[PDB]
């Protein structure tokens, strides 16, 4: 169970990184809306990771 949680935690970190790439891509694109979605996801994910 702990390993699954660790995997989930690892997945969350990976998910955050993927979201970060999108945010970086959005900046290059110059579209504000794409960037906003990524930021919200990072904050909730970080909180979940801390709890885990």
């Amino acid at each position: 169970a702990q390993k699954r949680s660790e995997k989930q935690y690892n997945d969350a970190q990976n998910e955050i990184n993927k979201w970060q790439r999108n945010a970086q891509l959005a900046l290059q694109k110059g579209d504000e809306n794409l960037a906003r979605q990524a930021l919200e996801r990072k904050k909730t994910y970080t909180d979940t990771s801390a709890a885990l």
Partner: peptide
């Protein structure tokens, strides 16, 4: 605040 942060990133 997030929008402001994005703008700062955009400037660089």
């Amino acid at each position: 605040d997030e929008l402001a942060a994005l703008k700062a990133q955009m400037l660089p």
